[PDB]
Amino acid sequence: DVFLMIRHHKTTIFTDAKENTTVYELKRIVEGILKRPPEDQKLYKDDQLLDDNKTLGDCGFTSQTARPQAPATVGLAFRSSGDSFEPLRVEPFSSPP
Amino acid sequence: RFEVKKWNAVALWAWD
Amino acid sequence: DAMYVKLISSDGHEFIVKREHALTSGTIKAMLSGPGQFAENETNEVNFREIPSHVLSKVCMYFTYKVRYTNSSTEIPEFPIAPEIALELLMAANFLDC
Amino acid sequence: SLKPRVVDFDETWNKLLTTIKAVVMLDYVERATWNDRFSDIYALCVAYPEPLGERLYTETKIFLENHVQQLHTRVLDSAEQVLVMYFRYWEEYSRGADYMDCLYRYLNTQYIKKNKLTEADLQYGYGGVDMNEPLMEIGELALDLWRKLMIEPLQDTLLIMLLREIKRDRCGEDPNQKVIHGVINSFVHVEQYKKKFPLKFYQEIFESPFLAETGEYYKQEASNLLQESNCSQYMEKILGRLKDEEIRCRKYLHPSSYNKVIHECQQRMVADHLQFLHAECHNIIRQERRNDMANMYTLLRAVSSGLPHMIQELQNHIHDEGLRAISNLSQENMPTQFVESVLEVHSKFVQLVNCVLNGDQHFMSALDKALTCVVNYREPKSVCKAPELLAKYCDNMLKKSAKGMTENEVEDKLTSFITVFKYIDDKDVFQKFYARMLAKRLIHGLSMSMDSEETMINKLKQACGYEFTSKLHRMYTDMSVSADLNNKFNNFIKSQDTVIDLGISFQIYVLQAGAWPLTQAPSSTFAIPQELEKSVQMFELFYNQHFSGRKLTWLHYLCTGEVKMNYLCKPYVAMVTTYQMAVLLAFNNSEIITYKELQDSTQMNEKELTKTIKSLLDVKMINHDSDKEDIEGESTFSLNMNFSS
Amino acid sequence: SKLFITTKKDYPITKSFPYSLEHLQVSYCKLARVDMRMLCLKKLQKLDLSNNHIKKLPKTIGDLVCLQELILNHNFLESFEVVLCSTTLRDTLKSLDLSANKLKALPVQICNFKELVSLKLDENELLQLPFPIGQLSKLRFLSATKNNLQCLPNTFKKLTLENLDLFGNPFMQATPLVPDIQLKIPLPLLETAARATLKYRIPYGPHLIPATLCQDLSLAKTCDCGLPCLNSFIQTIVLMNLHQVSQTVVLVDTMGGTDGPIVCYFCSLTCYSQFLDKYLQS
Ligand SMILES: [Zn+2]
């Protein structure tokens, strides 16, 4: 069981999945939430692009990291004009005093 | 000369 | 968003959360059950113009933590509360009733 | 920023009151404004150093009171339409009250519910604790003020309207069911917030007056229908009105009253006139009134003592009909006619009770009692003749003369018989009579097959237990093993060292003593002809070799055999008994035999001697050598030289 | 400095008392309410109003500055007011004897008066003794005999006294084996955040936190494990050795018995397990 926190600029999504989860089901979850075609968005992990075919078994999103009390942070970027994608300019959260 | 050909006897049995 | 509610913090951050995850707090359940005759236009927006994003994030985190750990007998761990986040997150829990 | 801060009351309360007015009736309001007002209420409830929970509560209460008073005035000004306007404003206000209860959730859960801490519960004081004008939920308060300021001041006007419309429905008119139902269940909905006696307000305000008025109206209706209509269509309209009333009660009132009304809609128009019903039911059952029987059954099962009188009357009718059916039995076929008549009565009345009277258990019990009295109907100064008739019926069913009837219908008639046989009160007489005629049939071999009496005795055992047919059980087993004993004796005869042709085809029947209902002739000392003493002694030795401590007795008033005339020109087959064989042996010894040699040979008493001699003279077996028409002790006889048959 | 009034004749109807008085004792007087005059005196050190018919205490004190010892037993007071505990009376009050009065639910706000040293609440019908007398560090004498005290506060287990009078009170049998399950898992977010806030032991106030939350924090129960619990707890009324709290314990018709019922509050079932193990072992 893995808990993921997708962050795409002024948006954040909490998702549930499993270790054998493929990237395509996360991508179609983002489809159902953003109704923007899946080839536009591509997932990341610490400024590193990740591919659709593989599963989260070796992605590093283990149950010890993807946790209900600390979901694994996942980036996301849609498609800009043409076949280009915007950078990972997702803003951080506010700073508690 | 006349003779009996059949007989259907009936009997009861009890303690001696 | 007819099955994913959206929470807008004061800072402007948008959080997309399962409806049942958000319904563990009474006030969100009331807010959705608001004026009635809801559009069901694939849009569930609730704007918390009073709580910072860094607190509403932990609110959604606790929503998931409560919802998945319900009806479970495993070794449930203590929820992480930072000392720099305890106060306003606590009063956010008050406003949310969860 | 979520923070306890100084908050000005009026500025927030402006938009708060605006949206509360917007929500109190169904009209458009933004979801964003809804959440903003949640935030505003939270800010108002907690503030430093001046909390505004009490001020917010009081102002909301005042606004609700003003709104409900305005609604009450507007509805009162709406004459001739109080109910419809009341229901419209009621549904609007109830939905708005639920919306406010949701919307003041922080106020309810953090101020109102914290102020009910009157007793010592770890939180004494520290908020409103003194008992003065108790606080309650905003939805609860809204409904409470609805009942105090809209319901009670309008109470008397509502009922007069409501009772008018329901009566209007009972007069055939069709009012708007939605409005009446809403008004009626509004009393429950308002009071819904009390844990104990939720319907109490409804019971006091609408239920009891409705019960009384329905009672009066249906008392009047019953009095009328009794006045212009006779009994049959009276029950017809009772049923119609009761059905329509139950439909109406479901249509309007709360479910908890659905029974009460009909209970008060039958006691006023059925249970108050069962005297008219009980006095007439006697006529109905003794006549062909099926639907009427069903109508009284339905009416009387509802009331307390309606059934037992009809039950007793039906018992009496069935008993009288059965007596009438069995009082005119033709003598030539009296057993079978009696059995079929009782069967027909039972079948017809069970069909009537199951089909029309729904097969009530009490009706079946009354039928059983009536038919039990019928079957044991004994004429004055006479004994119960039913067991003899039943046993004779079984006999006649099992006799050879039952030509053209196979087995299957024989067991069918058997099962049909068993129902009537169950009604017999003294089974012992029938048991003795049937045992007697079964013994007669078995000795004479006058039964369809072994399985016929098997089924007979098995069903008798089923009806009256094993011990009832115990001797019956032994008799058929003994007659069945008779063939086994006969073949065993034949094997023994072939087994002896020297075998002599006796010239007699010997058949035996060895029977258990006591079980068989055949009496031994007291000291008849009949002298067996010498052709049979060898058989007697060999059978005695055979049995006492194969049995330990057992003796044998021989009765010769039933043993029969075949005597054939062969040497003469008149070959005739004769079935002849022991005494008649002795007579023929004596007449064969000497052509002239007088009575003295008859006593010398037979050596038995005179009664059976003379009975046998008339038996022979009946078919012209022997010639009486004298002219005397009576046989004295000196009479002479000879064999018939010229006999034909 | 010492005056005594045992009759209405000795009680001045209009004229005021002299300023040289130190101890004022008023008894056997028909005073339905406390007069505003006597609250204006400067140095009433010990004030006694026993055997009066006062049902409501004054809302606010006028000018008293010390009021070291106040006695109001044998009065007609039903229930104290909330506001009267917001004054500086906490600073110097040493005792409060309200025995044989109609006090049925004493306000918990009395904990704000941390400076008392002796309490006498005999012959009352108080439902239960207040919770945070653990805030009363300087208390020495407590007595609440002949009251309907079902269960003592948990803080009472850690108080240290000299003598205690509690006989004649309804004490139910301890039921460790049958807990009352008000605990819920997973913990409420409010409960968890309050747990963290108390664990960090950081200051707070009604200006920073909403007042109701502040109060829930103030009365938050401290579990036996050493970590507090606001809600979702296990409440168990258990018997405890009374001789540890007070070096002498007085009871009725009990020889060798020193048991006192205290409602222990437990953070979690897991923490409750170690105390169950201690109960079984000891
Ligand atoms: Zn603990």
Which residue segments constitute the domains of chain A, with CATH numbers given?
2-85 (3.10.20.90)
Q: Which of C25, C93, C97 sits opposite E193 (nearest CB)?
A: C93
- Contact present, E153 and E135 (Cβ < 8 Å): no
* Residues of E whose CB is below 8 A from C98: 188-190
Tell me which residue of D161, D150, D163 sits closest to D75, measured CA to CA.
D150
Note every long-range contact of D479-488, with CB atoms under 8 Å and residues 24 or more positions apart, other chains counting. D479/D442, D479/D509, D479/D511, D480/D450, D482/D508, D482/D509, D482/D510, D485/D510, D488/D542, D488/D546
Within 8 A by CB and 6+ apart from E49, the residues are E26, E27, E31, E34, E71, E72, E75
Strand partners of residue E248: E163
Residue D371 Cα to ligand 1 middle (Å): 81
How many CB atoms sit inside 10 A of residue D451's CB?
13
Q: Both ends of chain D: CA-CA distance in Å?
A: 137
Angle at D551 between CA D547 and CA D553, to 5 degrees: 130
DSSP H or E stretch at residue D244: helix D231-252
* Residues of D whose CB is below 8 A from E215: 123, 126
Domain co-membership, E134 together with E8 = yes
Strand partners of residue E264: E236
SS3 C60: helix
Within 8 A by CB and 6+ apart from D639, the residues are D584, D587, D588, D591, D622, D623
Angle between helices D231-252 and D155-170 (to 10 degrees): 140
Residue E153 Cα to ligand 1 middle (Å): 17
Report how far Cα E129 is from the mean position of its chain's Cα atoms.
Answer: 6
Hey, is the C-beta of D18 within 8 angstroms of any chain C C-beta? no
- Contact present, C79 and C52 (Cβ < 8 Å): no
Determine whether D548 is exposed, middle or buried from the number of CB atoms within 10 Å of its CB (0-12, 13-18, 19+): exposed
Hey, is the C-beta of A36 within 8 angstroms of any chain C C-beta? no
Q: What is the length of chain D?
A: 645
Domain co-membership, E32 together with E104 = yes
Residue E227 Cα to ligand 1 middle (Å): 6
Residue E228 Cα to ligand 1 middle (Å): 7
CB within 8 Å: D559 and B8 = yes
Distance from CA of B2 to the nearest CA of D (A): 6
Domain co-membership, E120 together with E199 = no
In a domain? residue E79? yes
* Residues of C whose CB is below 8 A from A76: none
Residue E197 Cα to ligand 1 middle (Å): 16
SS3 D290: helix
Tell me which residue of D301, D426, D56, E37 sits closest to D293, measured CA to CA.
D301
Interface of D with E (CB under 8 A): 3-4, 45-46, 48-49, 51, 110-111, 114, 118-120, 122-127, 129-130
Distance, CA of E186 to CA of C69 (rounded, Å): 7
Strand partners of residue C14: C8
DSSP H or E stretch at residue C22: helix C19-22
Domain boundary, last residue among E149, E166, E191: E149
Within 8 A by CB and 6+ apart from D540, the residues are D552
Distance from CA of C36 to the nearest CA of E (A): 28
In a domain? residue E167? no
In a domain? residue E68? yes
Domain co-membership, E138 together with E48 = yes
**Which bin fits D376, alpha (ψ -120 to 50), beta or left (φ > 0)?**
alpha
Domain co-membership, E127 together with E80 = yes
Q: Which chains touch A (3 or more CB pairs under 8 A)?
A: C
- Contact present, D58 and D111 (Cβ < 8 Å): no
Query: By CA distance, what is E80's nearest residue in D?
Result: D125
In a domain? residue E188? yes
SS3 E48: strand
Angle between helices D274-285 and D306-326 (to 10 degrees): 20
Domain co-membership, E197 together with E89 = no
The pair of three-digit structure tokens given for residue A46, joined into one six-digit string: 């610490």
Tell me which residue of E82, E83, E38 sits closest to E64, measured CA to CA.
E38
CB–CB contacts below 8 A, C to D = 60
SS3 B5: strand
Strand partners of residue D511: B12
Mutation pick from D478, D479, D485, D504 vs chain B, by most beta carbons of B within 10 Å, is D504
- Contact present, E265 and E171 (Cβ < 8 Å): no
How many CB atoms sit inside 10 A of residue D604's CB?
22
Angle at D611 between CA D608 and CA D615, to 5 degrees: 130
CB within 8 Å: C48 and D23 = no
SS3 D511: strand
CB within 8 Å: E202 and C83 = yes
Hey, is the C-beta of E223 within 8 angstroms of any chain C C-beta? no
* Residues of D whose CB is below 8 A from C51: 2
Confirm whether residue E225 is marked as ligand binding: yes
| D 544-563 → B contacts, CB under 8 A | 547, 549-555, 558-563
Distance, CA of D432 to CA of D97 (rounded, Å): 88
DSSP H or E stretch at residue D164: helix D155-170
Q: Which of E185, E195, E212 sits opposite C76 (nearest CB)?
A: E185
Concatenating the DSSP letter of every residue in E122-179 gives TT---SS--SGGGG-TT--EEE-TTS---SB-SGGGG--EEEEE--SS--PPP-TTS-
Hey, is the C-beta of E186 within 8 angstroms of any chain C C-beta? yes
Domain boundary, last residue among E94, E127, E149: E149
Determine whether D551 is exposed, middle or buried from the number of CB atoms within 10 Å of its CB (0-12, 13-18, 19+): middle
Distance from CA of D50 to the nearest CA of E (A): 10
* Residues of C whose CB is below 8 A from A16: 64, 68
Query: By CA distance, what is C10's nearest residue in D?
Result: D1
**Strands of chain A, DSSP E:** 2-7, 12-17, 42-43, 72-77
Q: Which of C25, C76, C86 sits opposite E193 (nearest CB)?
A: C86
Distance, CA of D463 to CA of D336 (rounded, Å): 20
In a domain? residue E269? yes
Look up residue D150 and give its DSSP letter.
I
Domain count, chain E: 2
Within 8 A by CB and 6+ apart from D431, the residues are D464, D468, D469, D472
In a domain? residue E161? no
The pair of three-digit structure tokens given for residue E66, joined into one six-digit string: 């010390």
Domain co-membership, E7 together with E138 = yes
Angle at D293 between CA D289 and CA D299, to 5 degrees: 145
Residue E274 Cα to ligand 1 middle (Å): 9
Query: By CA distance, what is B4's nearest residue in D?
Result: D563
Residue E136's domain spans which residues?
1-149
Angle between helices D82-103 and D138-146 (to 10 degrees): 160
At position D254, the amino acid (one-letter code) is H
In a domain? residue E156? no
Residue E278 Cα to ligand 1 middle (Å): 14
Distance from CA of D58 to the nearest CA of E (A): 19
Domain co-membership, E40 together with E89 = yes
Distance from CA of C16 to the nearest CA of A (A): 5
Supply the CATH number for residue E116's domain: 3.80.10.10
Domain co-membership, E198 together with E119 = no
CB within 8 Å: B10 and D520 = no
Distance, CA of D438 to CA of D448 (rounded, Å): 12
Helices (H) and strands (E) counted in chain D, each on its own, are 26, 8
CB–CB contacts below 8 A, D to E = 52
Tell me which residue of C35, C40, C1, C33 sits closest to C17, measured CA to CA.
C1
CB within 8 Å: C49 and D105 = no
Residue E168's φ and ψ, nearest 5 degrees, are 80, 25
Domain co-membership, E144 together with E220 = no
Residue E272 Cα to ligand 1 middle (Å): 7
Domain boundary, last residue among E132, E149, E166: E149
Distance, CA of E39 to CA of D21 (rounded, Å): 49
Look up residue E64 and give its DSSP letter.
-
Query: Does an interface of 3+ CB pairs under 8 Å exist between C and D?
Result: yes
Annotated resolution, angstroms? 3.5
- Contact present, D267 and D327 (Cβ < 8 Å): no
Residue C87 Cα to ligand 1 middle (Å): 22
The pair of three-digit structure tokens given for residue C61, joined into one six-digit string: 């985190």
Breaks in chain D after residues, C-to-N cutoff 2.5 Å: none
Confirm whether residue E267 is marked as ligand binding: yes
Distance from CA of D589 to the nearest CA of B (A): 9
Domain co-membership, E72 together with E123 = yes
Alpha helix ranges (H) inside E148-282: 189-200, 211-218, 242-245, 269-281
Hey, is the C-beta of D532 within 8 angstroms of any chain B C-beta? yes
DSSP H or E stretch at residue E250: strand E246-250
Give a three-class secondary structure readout of D299-344. HHHHCCCHHHHHHHHHHHHHHHHHHHHHCCCCHHHHHHHHHHHHHH
Distance, CA of D46 to CA of D40 (rounded, Å): 10
Confirm whether residue E66 is marked as ligand binding: no
Technique of determination? cryo-EM
Domain co-membership, E58 together with E11 = yes
CB within 8 Å: A93 and C82 = no
Answer whether the bond into residue E186 is a cis peptide, omega within 30°.
yes
In a domain? residue E65? yes
Query: Does an interface of 3+ CB pairs under 8 Å exist between A and B?
Result: no
Look up residue D206 and give its DSSP letter.
I
Residue E152's φ and ψ, nearest 5 degrees, are -80, 155
Q: Could you identify the residue written with the tokens 């519960």?
A: D121
CB within 8 Å: C61 and A70 = yes
* Residues of D whose CB is below 8 A from B15: 549-551
Concatenating the DSSP letter of every residue in D405-472 gives --HHHHHHHHHHHHHHHHT-S-HHHHHHHHHHHHHHHHHHT-SS-HHHHHHHHHHHHHHH-TGGGHHH
